[PDB]
Amino acid sequence: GETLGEKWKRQLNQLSKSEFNTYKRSGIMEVDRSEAKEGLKRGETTKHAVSRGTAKLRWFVERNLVKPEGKVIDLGCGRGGWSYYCAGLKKVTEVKGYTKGGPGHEEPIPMATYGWNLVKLHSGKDVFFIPPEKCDTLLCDIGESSPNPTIEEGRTLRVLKMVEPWLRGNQFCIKILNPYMPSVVETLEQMQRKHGGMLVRNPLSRNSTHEMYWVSCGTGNIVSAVNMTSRMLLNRFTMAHRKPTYERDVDLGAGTRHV
Ligand SMILES: C[S@@+](CC[C@H](N)C(=O)[O-])C[C@H]1O[C@@H](n2cnc3c(N)ncnc32)[C@H](O)[C@@H]1O
Ligand SMILES: OC[C@@]1(O)OC[C@@H](O)[C@@H](O)[C@@H]1O
Ligand SMILES: [Cl-]
């Protein structure tokens, strides 16, 4: 009597490599990253978003699902995609990004995109072990995938326990790696009651992950959101019209900001 999400995961893990590669992009929204990738390889530091993450966060911001403002803390900042984007938003006054260093983990990329001077990224900073800090906006994009959904479940619950102390009177956008397991749904219901917001599927996410984001603005039934996302993902395995929808990548400009 598994959840629809569990049914999706078992089916995903049964795909061949070619099937997986076709499925992951079927009918998704996608930014053309060729130009940014080539530029970044050449050491270019203006205009380019450092990752696909900038476009993901832009989608939420454009729809007023999160409204970054004041002091922004970005947990699991990686290369800095979310941080460099927030740096260009009018209401943002400072951005601090923290990420885990080490082999196999992405390190921050120094960039000169608009508002770069308001951003301080720091590697070698495992957020599970640091004290929470006051901020006006809390972003978190942590959650490592695994073919084992119980491992993802444990990762998601650990992230949720970790972020809660950082939430008080502030905007937020937090990745929920595995939102479909019963303990996670229940945890999310409790945290939504305590801190508000809603759970949303980003159309730029690949079909190979069931990730959803808990955003501070709006409200909605979490069980419905999760189940409708699971149904969509299950239905995409045998999608008749699977062409992705392409959008231009984000241009983050250049120059310092004065607040
Ligand atoms: C998907 S990425 C971030 C993408 C980012 N939002 C962007 O737009 O470029 C998640 C990052 O969180 C980092 N991470 C994982 N566990 C962490 C921890 N305990 N503390 C800090 N960072 C962590 C990973 O190394 C990875 O770089
Ligand atoms: O509502 C916020 C809070 O009180 O929730 C319970 C724990 O997570 C605390 O660390 C956290 O500050
Ligand atoms: Cl609803």
Side-chain angles (χ1 to χ4, degrees):
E2 70 189 354
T3 59
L4 291 165
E6 286 170 275
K7 175 174 312 189
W8 163 82
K9 190 73 171 181
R10 290 175 66 189
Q11 186 162 349
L12 181 67
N13 287 342
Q14 291 179 348
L15 299 183
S16 66
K17 193 269 287 182
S18 67
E19 286 171 351
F20 180 91
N21 287 334
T22 300
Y23 172 74
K24 70 191 193 194
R25 293 188 186 87
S26 294
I28 76 171
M29 186 177 302
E30 175 174 346
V31 286
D32 184 355
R33 293 285 293 161
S34 292
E35 173 171 331
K37 284 178 175 172
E38 292 166 1
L40 291 166
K41 188 185 171 183
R42 292 191 292 253
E44 298 176 4
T45 53
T46 59
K47 303 186 290 184
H48 317 301
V50 300
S51 66
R52 286 186 183 278
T54 298
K56 281 168 68 182
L57 186 54
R58 180 182 63 179
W59 187 88
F60 292 133
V61 174
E62 280 178 336
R63 294 167 176 73
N64 303 130
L65 288 168
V66 59
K67 300 197 277 280
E69 61 184 353
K71 179 183 173 190
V72 180
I73 291 180
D74 178 12
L75 307 180
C77 71
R79 289 174 279 180
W82 283 20
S83 289
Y84 286 123
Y85 175 70
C86 288
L89 301 178
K90 181 67 184 305
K91 294 180 179 180
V92 172
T93 58
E94 77 187 74
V95 184
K96 297 181 75 190
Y98 309 143
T99 205
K100 201 165 62 167
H105 297 283
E106 297 183 348
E107 298 280 356
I109 296 183
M111 298 290 286
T113 44
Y114 187 60
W116 68 269
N117 59 301
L118 306 182
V119 183
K120 294 300 171 77
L121 307 178
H122 204 281
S123 191
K125 195 153 177 175
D126 187 336
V127 304
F128 288 127
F129 304 100
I130 68 180
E133 304 163 12
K134 186 168 192 166
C135 61
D136 301 301
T137 305
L138 187 289
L139 310 174
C140 183
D141 201 21
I142 299 175
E144 183 185 11
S145 59
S146 171
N148 186 333
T150 57
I151 291 174
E152 294 184 326
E153 179 185 11
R155 288 171 177 167
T156 304
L157 294 171
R158 200 192 184 183
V159 163
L160 287 163
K161 186 71 221 72
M162 178 277 295
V163 296
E164 201 184 11
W166 298 78
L167 305 181
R168 203 173 102 178
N170 55 6
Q171 293 286 321
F172 59 79
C173 177
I174 297 158
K175 181 185 156 185
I176 310 304
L177 170 68
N178 180 329
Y180 55 85
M181 301 295 281
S183 307
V184 178
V185 175
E186 176 184 334
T187 295
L188 287 170
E189 285 167 333
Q190 305 247 40
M191 299 179 76
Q192 178 187 50
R193 174 54 65 95
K194 294 189 68 191
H195 306 285
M198 65 180 301
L199 191 73
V200 185
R201 171 65 177 192
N202 190 305
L204 295 152
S205 289
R206 292 189 182 177
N207 304 319
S208 51
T209 172
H210 203 302
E211 68 186 16
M212 296 176 72
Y213 287 81
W214 175 35
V215 297
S216 52
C217 303
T219 189
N221 183 307
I222 291 174
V223 178
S224 296
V226 171
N227 283 327
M228 289 174 57
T229 296
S230 299
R231 283 207 179 78
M232 177 191 72
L233 295 171
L234 281 162
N235 286 327
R236 285 185 179 182
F237 288 117
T238 58
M239 191 167 196
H241 295 269
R242 66 166 178 76
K243 183 173 177 173
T245 291
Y246 297 95
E247 66 178 32
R248 295 189 314 285
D249 195 10
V250 187
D251 179 334
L252 301 178
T256 53
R257 274 186 72 202
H258 303 257
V259 166

